[PDB]
């Protein structure tokens, strides 16, 4: 039936059998099909792509073409009528710290990226879309609905570009369009070390033979490292404040500076790597540069898997955790570890956990300075507020003592993100993440809300009343039914997120199913999972079993007062113990007698 496959834009896969370590590109993880779970390959399709013309065009591209008998609503109208809200009062999640939201975006970034197609440089094309809002080819501008306020102050549209696709880049005619995942499907720290060897190498400090990641030589943080700047122009970290002139950081993943707290968690990770390479040298002084780099890199990957799977996933999935992620039973080579396309949308539930402000806290966790609390939008691509305003320590305190936004059926995505997002290469703090998301679903040819309900063994509502019983909400159901004339057409993103939260979790049934399934594949089909026998020594695993974000903080900042359960709401000083009483990552198990 289907062809052996397509693969013009990839090199060959030459695999070293003996090698202990993972590749930067992900390749060679799975031996029977080595390209499974590797960067620059097409996202997996758990269900046939759904496209206007069943090839590449997205629904909503042709006025005349409908989906299931009806026209799909404009992404911004859905955004305005359903996703928005004015009152930031009473929306904080009482039992989740703001680190919960942050750890989410880190893991998502480690897992997937589908960057747009590059026609922009040395071409007017990118400004042709913005300026006259002409939909063509890649340019798929997000139009404003009639009653939109932005019509008056911004124009007729929000620029938008279709994501890049495999066997690229002018349209081809045979199979449906498949977008690219430009990072490795494996929870492997790709966001710290890179997914391309070309970048992986640059990021490294090769000068000395100590296997350290390269750091900033222009600025420090109390004798603590900063990520190196990325001296590429134009830079949005420079554009948001042309007086301070501070470039964006250079990390393993392209999007590290998008918001100051992501940039922050990125700074914590780099350090933990360096701190580890230094510790290893000391125990195994005879180790060469590469070994220190590799062994350290290996440890940090284990660290993220434990945190994400032991501490994070259970509080996201809760009651559904065990249903989809039963305890480890070992590597299975028949498990597809590739990230599926819809997961890159399911995982965006995190957008409703982002709150309107960010604070900096002093040593008694009190407002640090006159403008300690800041509006989120002034922080997109804001790098100067870290270097020219006291560094990470104060921001990492806010991550521990503040709360994440709770998902709310009447209060979904905060305006900081819904009206004021800043997108590089554009000039204004006036974009909508919600609209984008919806437009992206359409761009990826995503199947409707009910196909996914069907895919998960859940009911498939066909009427208003049907939808109300599923969402447990009359007015939400009424609004969706009005815009979408049938559930079958509700874009998965807004669909999955409209479902109420499963008890003890922070997502509904549909997302618990889609997320749960992906993460289980991510663990089970990974030849290098930290717990998979033979990857680490029996003793090393026991050592790793004690890791904690608290510990990661204590070891890489001068914060000496942390909670024990970093992801839950914790107030100071009651829920805050001294760092001394927190387990360490004793690295003794790594000694290597040469004799
Ligand atoms: C600003 C932005 C954030 C915080 C202030 C933010 C945050 C998150 C969290 C907390 C997530 C998970 C719990 C999460 C998931 C995904 N995001 Fe989102 N994000 C901010 C801004 C963006 C922008 C811009 C995009 C691009 C959207 C597009 O289609 O162009 C974005 C995406 C995603 C995304 C998809 C990744 C992929 O596979 O391409 C998540 C899975 N975020 N974000
Ligand atoms: C641009 O960055 C500069 C540099 O930090 C910010 O300027 C500082 O802000 C206050 C003054 O209100 C001072 O505490 C710093 O010393 C200032 N530095 C300088 C050189 O003025 C400025 O606030 C930022 N501008 C914007 C629009 O974000
Ligand atoms: C590389 O390592 C050496 C030795 O630790 C250090 O002095 C130097 O600053 C580092 N260079 C970079 C760019 O990190
Ligand atoms: C391995 O994966 C295949 C396909 O997902 C599955 O049928 C099989 O049950 C798995 N092996 C184990 C031990 O579960
Ligand atoms: C808070 O969350 C933790 C998990 O992080 C849970 O064990 C605890 O019971 C929760 N508290 C409440 C009031 O639900
Ligand atoms: O281009 C960037 O670096 C920011 C774009 C971005 C950032 C974080 C998540 C998705 C997209
Ligand atoms: Ca990865």
PDB file of N, CA and C in Angstrom, residues 358-373 393-402 561 571-573 576:
ATOM      1  N   UNK A 358       5.462  38.332  36.814  1.00  0.00           N
ATOM      2  CA  UNK A 358       6.612  37.621  37.334  1.00  0.00           C
ATOM      3  C   UNK A 358       7.271  38.522  38.374  1.00  0.00           C
ATOM      4  N   UNK A 359       7.729  37.922  39.472  1.00  0.00           N
ATOM      5  CA  UNK A 359       8.364  38.671  40.552  1.00  0.00           C
ATOM      6  C   UNK A 359       9.802  38.243  40.830  1.00  0.00           C
ATOM      7  N   UNK A 360      10.542  39.128  41.494  1.00  0.00           N
ATOM      8  CA  UNK A 360      11.921  38.889  41.909  1.00  0.00           C
ATOM      9  C   UNK A 360      11.860  38.950  43.442  1.00  0.00           C
ATOM     10  N   UNK A 361      12.389  37.938  44.128  1.00  0.00           N
ATOM     11  CA  UNK A 361      12.303  37.932  45.590  1.00  0.00           C
ATOM     12  C   UNK A 361      13.643  37.968  46.323  1.00  0.00           C
ATOM     13  N   UNK A 362      13.711  38.753  47.400  1.00  0.00           N
ATOM     14  CA  UNK A 362      14.944  38.855  48.175  1.00  0.00           C
ATOM     15  C   UNK A 362      15.124  37.619  49.034  1.00  0.00           C
ATOM     16  N   UNK A 363      16.151  37.657  49.865  1.00  0.00           N
ATOM     17  CA  UNK A 363      16.519  36.525  50.715  1.00  0.00           C
ATOM     18  C   UNK A 363      15.493  36.079  51.776  1.00  0.00           C
ATOM     19  N   UNK A 364      14.479  36.898  52.039  1.00  0.00           N
ATOM     20  CA  UNK A 364      13.422  36.534  52.984  1.00  0.00           C
ATOM     21  C   UNK A 364      12.176  36.447  52.119  1.00  0.00           C
ATOM     22  N   UNK A 365      12.406  36.142  50.843  1.00  0.00           N
ATOM     23  CA  UNK A 365      11.350  36.006  49.849  1.00  0.00           C
ATOM     24  C   UNK A 365      10.371  37.172  49.839  1.00  0.00           C
ATOM     25  N   UNK A 366      10.913  38.390  49.888  1.00  0.00           N
ATOM     26  CA  UNK A 366      10.108  39.622  49.880  1.00  0.00           C
ATOM     27  C   UNK A 366      10.378  40.450  48.619  1.00  0.00           C
ATOM     28  N   UNK A 367       9.456  41.329  48.261  1.00  0.00           N
ATOM     29  CA  UNK A 367       9.646  41.946  46.963  1.00  0.00           C
ATOM     30  C   UNK A 367      11.059  42.486  46.991  1.00  0.00           C
ATOM     31  N   UNK A 368      11.800  42.050  45.986  1.00  0.00           N
ATOM     32  CA  UNK A 368      13.159  42.492  45.700  1.00  0.00           C
ATOM     33  C   UNK A 368      13.105  43.778  44.885  1.00  0.00           C
ATOM     34  N   UNK A 369      13.261  44.911  45.556  1.00  0.00           N
ATOM     35  CA  UNK A 369      13.244  46.172  44.844  1.00  0.00           C
ATOM     36  C   UNK A 369      11.871  46.754  44.567  1.00  0.00           C
ATOM     37  N   UNK A 370      11.848  47.989  44.071  1.00  0.00           N
ATOM     38  CA  UNK A 370      10.591  48.711  43.829  1.00  0.00           C
ATOM     39  C   UNK A 370       9.672  48.056  42.794  1.00  0.00           C
ATOM     40  N   UNK A 371      10.224  47.558  41.691  1.00  0.00           N
ATOM     41  CA  UNK A 371       9.406  46.883  40.679  1.00  0.00           C
ATOM     42  C   UNK A 371       9.737  45.401  40.651  1.00  0.00           C
ATOM     43  N   UNK A 372       9.673  44.762  41.813  1.00  0.00           N
ATOM     44  CA  UNK A 372       9.974  43.342  41.906  1.00  0.00           C
ATOM     45  C   UNK A 372       9.019  42.556  41.022  1.00  0.00           C
ATOM     46  N   UNK A 373       7.728  42.870  41.100  1.00  0.00           N
ATOM     47  CA  UNK A 373       6.731  42.194  40.279  1.00  0.00           C
ATOM     48  C   UNK A 373       6.631  42.912  38.935  1.00  0.00           C
ATOM     49  N   UNK A 393      19.186  34.226  40.680  1.00  0.00           N
ATOM     50  CA  UNK A 393      18.805  33.947  42.071  1.00  0.00           C
ATOM     51  C   UNK A 393      17.431  34.482  42.490  1.00  0.00           C
ATOM     52  N   UNK A 394      17.151  35.781  42.236  1.00  0.00           N
ATOM     53  CA  UNK A 394      15.858  36.383  42.599  1.00  0.00           C
ATOM     54  C   UNK A 394      14.663  35.850  41.803  1.00  0.00           C
ATOM     55  N   UNK A 395      14.912  35.442  40.564  1.00  0.00           N
ATOM     56  CA  UNK A 395      13.845  34.927  39.711  1.00  0.00           C
ATOM     57  C   UNK A 395      13.537  33.480  40.077  1.00  0.00           C
ATOM     58  N   UNK A 396      14.576  32.752  40.465  1.00  0.00           N
ATOM     59  CA  UNK A 396      14.403  31.380  40.879  1.00  0.00           C
ATOM     60  C   UNK A 396      13.655  31.353  42.214  1.00  0.00           C
ATOM     61  N   UNK A 397      13.671  32.461  42.955  1.00  0.00           N
ATOM     62  CA  UNK A 397      12.922  32.505  44.206  1.00  0.00           C
ATOM     63  C   UNK A 397      11.433  32.675  43.876  1.00  0.00           C
ATOM     64  N   UNK A 398      11.142  33.505  42.885  1.00  0.00           N
ATOM     65  CA  UNK A 398       9.759  33.692  42.487  1.00  0.00           C
ATOM     66  C   UNK A 398       9.142  32.408  41.953  1.00  0.00           C
ATOM     67  N   UNK A 399       9.950  31.612  41.246  1.00  0.00           N
ATOM     68  CA  UNK A 399       9.501  30.323  40.697  1.00  0.00           C
ATOM     69  C   UNK A 399       9.082  29.362  41.814  1.00  0.00           C
ATOM     70  N   UNK A 400       9.719  29.498  42.973  1.00  0.00           N
ATOM     71  CA  UNK A 400       9.403  28.655  44.111  1.00  0.00           C
ATOM     72  C   UNK A 400       8.222  29.159  44.942  1.00  0.00           C
ATOM     73  N   UNK A 401       8.155  30.471  45.168  1.00  0.00           N
ATOM     74  CA  UNK A 401       7.097  31.064  46.007  1.00  0.00           C
ATOM     75  C   UNK A 401       5.837  31.618  45.336  1.00  0.00           C
ATOM     76  N   UNK A 402       5.782  31.651  44.008  1.00  0.00           N
ATOM     77  CA  UNK A 402       4.569  32.142  43.374  1.00  0.00           C
ATOM     78  C   UNK A 402       3.792  30.971  42.816  1.00  0.00           C
ATOM     79  N   UNK A 561      17.449  28.333  50.929  1.00  0.00           N
ATOM     80  CA  UNK A 561      16.171  28.038  51.557  1.00  0.00           C
ATOM     81  C   UNK A 561      15.179  27.584  50.491  1.00  0.00           C
ATOM     82  N   UNK A 571       4.835  28.187  50.781  1.00  0.00           N
ATOM     83  CA  UNK A 571       5.067  29.533  51.298  1.00  0.00           C
ATOM     84  C   UNK A 571       6.252  29.577  52.253  1.00  0.00           C
ATOM     85  N   UNK A 572       6.856  30.755  52.353  1.00  0.00           N
ATOM     86  CA  UNK A 572       8.026  30.982  53.204  1.00  0.00           C
ATOM     87  C   UNK A 572       7.614  31.661  54.512  1.00  0.00           C
ATOM     88  N   UNK A 573       8.250  31.274  55.637  1.00  0.00           N
ATOM     89  CA  UNK A 573       9.271  30.226  55.660  1.00  0.00           C
ATOM     90  C   UNK A 573       8.782  28.850  56.066  1.00  0.00           C
ATOM     91  N   UNK A 576       9.650  26.009  53.855  1.00  0.00           N
ATOM     92  CA  UNK A 576      11.043  26.133  53.424  1.00  0.00           C
ATOM     93  C   UNK A 576      12.081  25.650  54.437  1.00  0.00           C
TER      94      UNK A 576
END
